[PDB]
Amino acid sequence: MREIVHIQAGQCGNQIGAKFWEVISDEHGIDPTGSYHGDSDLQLERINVYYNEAAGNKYVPRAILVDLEPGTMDSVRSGPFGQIFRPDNFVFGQSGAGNNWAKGHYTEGAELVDSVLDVVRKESESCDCLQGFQLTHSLGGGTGSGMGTLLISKIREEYPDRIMNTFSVMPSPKVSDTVVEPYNATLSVHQLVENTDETYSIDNEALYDICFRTLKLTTPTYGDLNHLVSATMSGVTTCLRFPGQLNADLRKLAVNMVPFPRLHFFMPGFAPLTSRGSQQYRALTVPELTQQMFDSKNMMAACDPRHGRYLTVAAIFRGRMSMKEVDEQMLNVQNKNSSYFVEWIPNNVKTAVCDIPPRGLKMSATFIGNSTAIQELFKRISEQFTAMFRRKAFLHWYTGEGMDEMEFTEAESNMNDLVSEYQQYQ
């Protein structure tokens, strides 16, 4: 019944993933041992979406863990929930990706993908009815960007009709840790625009802006950023895991969210978000949950939506709430902000409403914005890329893996084609 297969690639993908498994195990009431300890039958009713039953009523999450280094497997396996995963689904190399896309895609991960893909088969053939693949990775560095998009290509060719749904942490100028970030991302977005059915674009600059200007965290770690990402990952699948007044499968999102095939690069968000010193003073009610959710400060990519227009927004609400109040607020937003929505679509907002809010919240909304403003995330990458590529800077590390200089020309060409298609509807 609508099983999902989840795949983690590189350090970032395994870190946002290993936090996501702590979040959905709290929701479904599963112990770090893999045993069930929850309150409610609704927690157990759809546990098959993300888990397998195993002998003695222990539960095994349907995750594949992929890396070219042992050290992130060692960090996950030793971690808060590391004992939950199947020991055979940790698939890894020894020598890393060197922050090189071409090592991921052609050498170090091309060796390993035969050992990954045959585990993705054992999980997918154990499904009753697979709905899709849920892949966590980063577009900077070499493992997530280059091996993760190799793996997307292999799973897309093998499962052409299932949903391919990716959560993609990606480069930005003011929060960067790699010299060759622009190259790796431009080579990787060239695979995402063709193969994925949805890609949720996420930025460490926007995840630090939520931590500083909304949560007011004094020293936000990567563990705090991974918690913001994984809240929206739990959010978008909620309607296949819990009952609701309006149910929306990942495919019911895609049909409403993607007007033209390639315009599937979304921008997520979450509500409520408060400082722990101000939760005492705020109402979680749908109008306040909405005024936050559409705020340019709340979204998890650097794109101010005021520099574009939304094609579609989806608001996946959770909690006991009025359909009049939800339908009123999703109307009031796109009429009072009508200059920020495309006027050849007569209603730009999809709504969904689940009966079960997150543990310790009375209400939640997960936001998905398909916005022409997303052009500014691909443009700033492509312009960082150009200044390095025109002088062939660092290309001996990629051409040493047998990659052509023509493949950089062709990836940047396909990046400008993706920018052109979002600018066209603006």
Partner: protein
């Protein structure tokens, strides 16, 4: 004798069904486990087994498990037959073509044979009651697959159809205009009387009459079910002037394709208001001709009435009803067509409206459901085909429908057939 098969499709049809069967059980005094403590009044809606258990003449169908698995687990899990609750693996994704061509294509065989096992269990059969959303993928595409089969397998039998239809402003989906326009062949060719209803109109009725500031869907479905109880009450109970399900159609439908009546109910009222007004036959009759009580956001004064069925129930008398409709004929703002000099079909039934004990709606000695064929409803079609035109001029979502086995030309062939219905309702007003 006098059976109805009730088919509840997609989330909207199943959730209206979960209110319909909540009401019918109270109205006939059937427990939620199907037993009856202590006349054949239940026989239209329930099959009686020799064990003394009343099993509903219903089919619930959804292409995904979630909503029917809730019916299989809640208070009515003991009522329904375990395989009249039918589920697929895969959601229709608000895509007509998944409902009609790709996903519903598999489950249809199971649905149609479970309908056969109801129809072969009825001693005579009055018609079908089909409940659905116009905006859904299962709602539009599976209902249109099912109706095409039922219209060759049961060609004589009346198919009455209750549709939650897209609003002027309130919407839950981007592709709601595409699914609704693709449905217009179903209602035109494979339906006999189609009751359009609107979420935004009932939300406004709830705000003004029930004093509820922010309603859910449970409040809406308790109004949509109350209409079908009042349509069927003459089939189920004693009355002064009972109306048969085809007697109804012979007065509602002036022309073969002109079978889209409005519906409304009175008194919709809060229990706190209902003490401070007397709610006479003349008051509740006049309430049916207010724009404020129409359950589609269109104005009846921008139309002409072709025919009205005033289906009264509870403590009403033919004296009062004739004296009431004489005041409606006197008012120049309520305009009938020149060719319907009679105008009104009256039904009167002795059974008051049942109150759902958890509901928002008062106990009242009397109600009326007015079902009304009027030219005004063409504006609710003129709204939605203007939403369709903006998106089809871009082909704005068409690859999801073409990708699941639909011909691209069906969108033009559906917008064309809707323009011929919107023509027919303008043509007969003259």
């Amino acid at each position: 004798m006098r059976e109805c098969i009730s088919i509840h499709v997609g989330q909207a049809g199943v959730q209206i069904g979960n209110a319909c069967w909540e009401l019918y059980c109270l109205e006939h005094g059937i427990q939620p486990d199907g037993q009856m403590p202590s006349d054949d009044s239940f026989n239209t809606f329930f099959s009686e087994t020799g064990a003394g258990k009343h099993v509903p003449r219903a089919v619930f169908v959804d292409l995904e498990p979630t909503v029917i698995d809730e019916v299989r687990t809640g208070t009515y899990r003991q009522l329904f037959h375990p395989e009249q609750l039918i589920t697929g693996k895969e959601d229709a994704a608000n895509n007509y073509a998944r409902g009609h061509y790709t996903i519903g294509k598999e489950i249809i065989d199971l649905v149609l044979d479970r309908i056969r096992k109801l129809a072969d269990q009825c001693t005579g059969l009055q018609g079908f009651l089909v409940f659905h959303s116009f905006g859904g993928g299962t709602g539009s595409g599976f209902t249109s697959l099912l109706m095409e089969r039922l219209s060759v397998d049961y060609g004589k039998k009346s198919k009455l159809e209750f549709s939650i239809y897209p609003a002027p402003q309130v919407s839950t989906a981007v592709v709601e205009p595409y699914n609704s326009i693709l449905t217009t062949h179903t209602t035109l060719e494979h339906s006999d009387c189609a009751f359009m209803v609107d979420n935004e109109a009932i939300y406004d009725i709830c705000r003004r009459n029930l004093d509820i500031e922010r309603p859910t869907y449970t409040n809406l479905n308790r109004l949509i079910s109350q209409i079908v109880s009042s349509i069927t009450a003459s089939l189920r109970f004693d009355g002064a002037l009972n109306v048969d399900l085809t007697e109804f159609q012979t007065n509602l439908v002036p022309y073969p394709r002109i079978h889209f009546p409005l519906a409304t109910y009175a008194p919709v009222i809060s229990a706190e208001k209902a003490y401070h007004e007397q709610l006479s036959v003349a008051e509740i009759t006049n309430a049916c001709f207010e724009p404020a009580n129409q359950m589609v956001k269109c104005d009846p004064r921008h139309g002409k009435y072709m025919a009205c069925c005033l289906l009264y129930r509870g403590d009403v008398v033919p004296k009062d009803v004739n004296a009431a409709i004489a005041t409606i004929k006197t008012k120049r703002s309520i305009q009938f067509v020149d060719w319907c000099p009679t105008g009104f079909k009256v039904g009167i039934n002795y059974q008051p409206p049942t109150v759902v004990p958890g509901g928002d709606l008062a106990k009242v000695q009397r109600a009326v459901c007015m079902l009304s064929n009027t030219t005004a409803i063409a504006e609710a079609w003129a709204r939605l085909d203007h939403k369709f035109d903006l998106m089809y001029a871009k082909r704005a979502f068409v690859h999801w429908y073409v990708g699941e086995g639909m011909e691209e030309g069906e969108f033009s062939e559906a917008r064309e057939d809707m323009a011929a219905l919107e023509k027919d309702y303008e043509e007969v007003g003259v």
